[PDB]
Symmetry: D3
Subunit: 331 residues, 6 copies
């Protein structure tokens, strides 16, 4: 089968209106919450909206059997104040993902957002993690820039600021899916910030002692590692002047295949090997447009991997399901 | 012949001491200047230093016949204060590069740094440009982040802040060579900041109307365009939702081949085409380490391009000299 | 008839989702816009939402014949970055209001928000004002604190920063309706910031030369003038030292009656007079809860004014329609 | 008798000069102190200053028998640096008040200021409180905005930042008298910031669990509660969603009657009841100007309360003495 | 006779209470002003207060015939906000000095404060200067640090920011008396800040083109030039590496003799010469204490100058009156 | 003999290049270190550079027999970021001074810089102190303004922030040598900042209870105490109003004689006494210019002190060696 490990929830419109409300009253109305029926959630999983077809129908047309759906990361406003609106909105997004996956278990698998408030100690997400574990969540999006390209930065991923999280992720044996959220920059909007932050997080993890101290830490890097597989040479060369090679740590990482050109998919898989690649597409999303040359949808990239003549059937099965089954502890 | 369009001056130690001195007295001793002889300038280009050999010796070994040399960008301190030390140090480095390329015209071709002070209008570099144009300089390093990964950032390259510079570059029909300088981030050291800044600059140039207003502007993006050829799919798909495709703007851009893996070189050349690639290696520097297994130096990448079977000998001539002669107006 | 001069649009949820999206991509998707059909705009004016009944049904129950609807001001994020998102959102809200008033003209009258970006010159709203003027809009919400209780504040209303706007309004003979937006303070939330900012704006206007320089300027202060009618004594006393009395300038101002206690309404009307009071309720909204002692909604305040012994039927007609009809240039 | 619970010290000019000097040398001359004789402290309570007559003469004319005098709060510079100057000045004002009440005991009762330094833990006032408690002081002015309308603000009164103080006050069975100090805003000067901060403090106290955790806490809000009695309806309505009604907590609060209009006094008394109103005038002060329509000083408000038809003589005795005598632990 | 050129007004207490009031209501009460009778001002000139005797009586005991009285500079709060309180308080101090000098013309001469608001253009003092010229004022205190040792600095005295003032001072042929005001620093309180700022202002004036561009500019530096006469050597040595000597400019400056040790007075006079020294004492003030060795008052320094055996009677007359007569255009 | 207690290392050019390199890569290349031979270290002390002659040659000519050398303070960049480059550069300069004084024990005696990072607790220098104590260092340069004339400043020297250091200095019975470093001010260049900071530090030490708590603490103030001996009168008069006279605290202090005018030298020695003066010249440096009239070099000041008639030969022995031997524990 084909399990897509990088998907984002198609939610009822009421969720985003709840965000607007929280930002309007900033808590003076109390927490409240999203009021939507199961019917409305299911219908949201079918609504066309801005995509060529519905979420479910698109996955069906592309042969994707199941998909791990997480929050749409650029809505999560990790730099917004006050902090409690960040926490509340994260919790409600997670609740809605849980409801949708319970209503549509034949396709959708839950992955959780973290209520990362810029500047707060990472411990402040543990409670929500616990709530999500009980609800059956299979992973967590880890944002390396809760400041959302502001004037300040979070510590690098090798800083012990993040160590309490790694510990917990190993106790649960659940993965962190690197994903930045929004960006306050006029130069670098969110979709490009994703790439730069993936590059930075990978670099941090591959030039620190994280994997010495948490050898079972499972990390999936979004969008084929940002820039790293393409730029691996300079970083390996510079890592020679040190006690560990960049590739030494990088061999511990997993990467999803959210890349919309055959050449990039080929380079990713040849660089890290099928043992460390998990099929992903972000369909529906950035890539849900039609290539005017072929008429196909750009995020319908499974056939590119299925036709690579340098991968065995075992390697393609690793990429399409087994790696996801292990990393996300899927039933 | 082989022309390397991305090299950095091996300078006598007195230049860096002059930088330190300027920062120490901050102008209270006057402008002063570097004090070195022609002999010391020539000797610097043969001294081993940390490299496996002298700059010129490594070029001779790798088969490189001429190299365009610019300042070592991470020393240019565009965010340093007061402004006058940034200007003065840029001026002295340019004067020294001029002296070296006049003393050794067989190997070296001069490329200038711009005295970009964070927050200053871009026109404040024009004077220095003129001076360098009178000294035979063939291009300019354009830093998209003169704030050097600080609390603030400059406007995106599509902003009209930069338009006075594009004008002048078209007036001179000379190219800009995109290259960041330092990085103040504890997460992102300068060598990774290079890549991210190239990604951002290319994105700005390909999502704005710069090339509609300056069709003749010549721009060379360093390090194979950061993440862009690898991440082209998502940005092209997103651009489909606008009036001009990312690809039609990117077709106007040139990229150098400072990539230290065969696979990345292949991906670059197959994505942008040999008509838009200029050979470059940054030898000596980040890539001047010996692969302990295969015995060769990582920045010795000309043979990779020579052996690509999908390139004709004319395509290889383009990559190795003709594009450089056209873009940098080489004699 | 009964005209309610202080109402806020009951809009389809797609509008608030559009706000969320604008904040999410900060303009990198383009302006885009609210995509919503006429039938959705109509249905939103009847949906119960968190109120006991729909907007229109409530106005019917309370006997209100027409309401001037403006944006829900605590959503207008005047302090948000980048500036273009606050401009775009204000514009979208204005056009949606225009559409709703065009579709339900027997009930709703359009009042526009201003795309006030904290720190921008006020002239930057004119382009939108002009547009709204050609769409038939009858007034503009004026926010004295576009910084939304931040680390900085805007100039007081007496400062010449605002004088271009005061000029244009007089050019148009259309009123400003003082209304604050959001509040970033952890001490003073938006509903209380409304009152504090009404107090500050009224004080600014009654201690400067705005009305000397703009005699025909029409200004309606929300929520019965905040604290001023209750605290008028101290301000009058301190003004005695000045060249003009506080009351001298205050008499040029209009106030709406959005007060949810009979005593407050009595004080307001007895303080500023029926010639300067315009009926308003903000129904549905903060006051749309049941007073258990009466069983009636707290914002069903028209009967209090109707049953005031100290007002003639002509004064009540001023409060309930004539004043609004003249201040907001309404048709008849 | 008539006890005025809101008065401010008429002090010799040497005190304000001492403030100026403290700001001038910022402590490099040492703490020093106000150097002023008993005769000067007495003379200051009779000097006309900018008022029509002396402090004591005015209180005599108005029929006030005793007044609780506290610091002039707009001078206490809680946002000034370095912290030690605000501490020293508060201490000096407190001791001068103590001396004046010791010299004129038939008229004046001491109420202390707190040396609140913006950003300091509240515990840093305890040492002064203790001292004032041993000097016979009967209450403390509590400033909810020691930042004085700056770029930052203090925690709301419901925050545990204030809980130590609430504890100590209950330990002492002495009241806090809500009063803001200065205002750095160019829109909202100090006299209006008083009202806005009273509104914010009252809202904080009526929407938190302060009175659940400190049931016997005695709090007197200045100037008739700012805007709250006039704007109570909206806050009650919004509180309905909470677990406690706004009025539920508001009933635990006391308010002084420093309002210079008959209508405002009527509203206050009818809203909170005579059991929670303490007569206060701030005479001499902002209200010490002549109402031309009456010839009487605007802060001569006791007759309004005396002539209210809807109050028994016993309710008026509560307002004029019993409530102050019980809240401020006064002798008889 | 003995004319003391550095004195500060002994004002009625009502002035400082007016300062406190302005800072309390910040303008909401309107400008207002100081209400004091002539009798009260005269009495203030006699009040003991904190000094061993009254101002007038102290000048009498020391043989000082007349004294130029200016504001007490550390009260002038040039960094306070809003600006109008700074302007108003300056104007009222000047009005009171004018009244006192008119009431006591047998001794007191008026010198004016400038309403210098940190960050405002210097032109904003011209109006008050004019008001003071009409009232007969003989000079102006010039503060080189209106920021009062804050996080920011004013431009150096050679910056053209100050040029409109110099121009005006030459049109009036009236002097600037360098005097800092207050200091917000915990390290360096006002009395020491005076010294450091005198040093900085002198350095600025002696390493810039001020005296090239305003050759008739009259400047009196307080407290014997801060540190400069004592430290003149290093600055002269460093000025040799430049187009003008430090002493070249320094010869244009005047210095007052507010120094309370014989050795410092000797060094000042021997360094700059009697032609450029104006007698000053700041009595009553910092120096109004008793030397327990001699019983004399430390600011009774006229006899030190009268007994120096290296000065002629003409030099002592230059120091004690003629220089003041010329510089301050005294009747 | 003549011992000069205020000299600064003439270092090989590679040290300043190492500073520039550290600032360029900000630690991403690791600590590294200066790479110079014993021969280059020795040659640096004989190279003319800008001086009229080599460092050692000038010392020989002036009659100086030994000199205590410390870092050139204006290069130590105590306000630079990140902290680790400040620490590393201080450590390398100290190691180089150690190498030079071990190679040339006839002339040079080692004095250490402190790795003071602005805002760091002072205890963060103790480690380095210990290392230097194991290398035979005889004192430490104490910078009162590690913020280098910035928006912020450190606590005054009387604040208990510094008390841990006083303790250690008494534990080692070694002295602090007050000396500022750089200055970010556009009004006050580093050479004037030296003087002002010495004034402030001396004032703090003489108006606080430091010497009541550390009676044995040894402190040497540079440049004759900035302004203090010249401005002593006002501060003594002000201190009379307190519990301890300025003079009784100042009597515990030592001062060096880095003054380039005879008159200032005289004033210093007559104010503080020969029992508290240590000869010092800062030769070569700011004072190494030739008086074009009198032919001699300005920092050749030993003869001035030799010719003072009011000093006995024992007083001159104190100034020229004994005080230095006692304070700096010289062998
Ligand atoms: C600035 C830079 C520096 C080095 O290569 C380098 C220098 C010294 C030691 C080791 C490496 C490279 C580039 O600009 C580039 O990568 O294009
Ligand atoms: C402002 C000033 C203050 C005093 O003189 C003073 C004031 C009150 C008590 C004690 C001293 C001195 C100077 O400006 C100067 O020293 O020139
Ligand atoms: C830092 C310093 C620098 C010079 O002397 C100097 C250096 C290079 C060229 C010219 C002068 C001196 C002192 O520390 C001092 O004055 O004590
Ligand atoms: Zn994603
Ligand atoms: Zn490069
Ligand atoms: Zn409203
Ligand atoms: Zn009061
Ligand atoms: Zn003075
Ligand atoms: Zn030195």
């Amino acid at each position: 089968m084909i399990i897509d490990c990088h998907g984002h929830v198609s939610a009822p419109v009421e969720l985003w209106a709840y965000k607007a409300s929280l930002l309007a009253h900033r808590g003076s109305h109390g927490r409240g919450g999203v009021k939507v029926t199961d019917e409305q959630i299911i219908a949201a999983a079918h609504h066309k909206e801005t995509w060529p077809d519905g979420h479910i129908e698109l996955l069906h047309n592309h042969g994707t059997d199941m998909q791990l759906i997480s929050p749409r990361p650029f809505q999560m406003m990790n730099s917004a104040k006050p902090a409690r609106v960040v926490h509340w909105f994260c919790e409600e997004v997670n609740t809605l993902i849980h409801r949708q996956c319970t209503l549509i278990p034949e396709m959708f698998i839950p992955v959780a957002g973290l209520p990362q408030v810029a500047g707060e100690p990472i411990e402040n997400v543990f409670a929500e993690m616990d709530r999500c574990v009980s609800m059956g969540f299979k992973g967590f999006l880890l944002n390396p820039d809760p400041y959302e390209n502001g004037a300040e930065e979070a510590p690098p991923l090798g800083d012990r600021y993040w160590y309490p999280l790694y510990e917990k992720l190993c106790e649960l044996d659940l993965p962190a899916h690197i994903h930045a959220t929004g960006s306050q920059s006029e130069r670098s909007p969110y979709s490009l910030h994703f790439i730069n932050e993936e590059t930075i997080a990978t670099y941090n993890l591959c030039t620190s002692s994280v994997f010495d101290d948490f050898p079972q830490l499972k990390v999936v890097v979004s969008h084929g590692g940002g820039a790293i597989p393409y730029q691996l040479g300079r970083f390996e060369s510079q890592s020679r002047r040190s006690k560990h090679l960049f590739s030494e740590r990088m061999a511990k990482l997993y990467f999803d295949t959210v890349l919309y050109t055959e050449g990039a998919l080929r380079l990713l898989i040849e660089t890290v090997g099928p043992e460390r690649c998990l099929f992903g597409s972000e369909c529906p999303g950035v890539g849900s447009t039609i290539d005017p040359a072929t008429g196909k949808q750009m995020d319908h990239i499974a056939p590119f991997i299925q036709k690579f003549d340098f991968l065995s059937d075992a390697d393609k099965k690793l990429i399409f399901e087994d790696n996801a089954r292990k990393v996300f502890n899927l039933e």
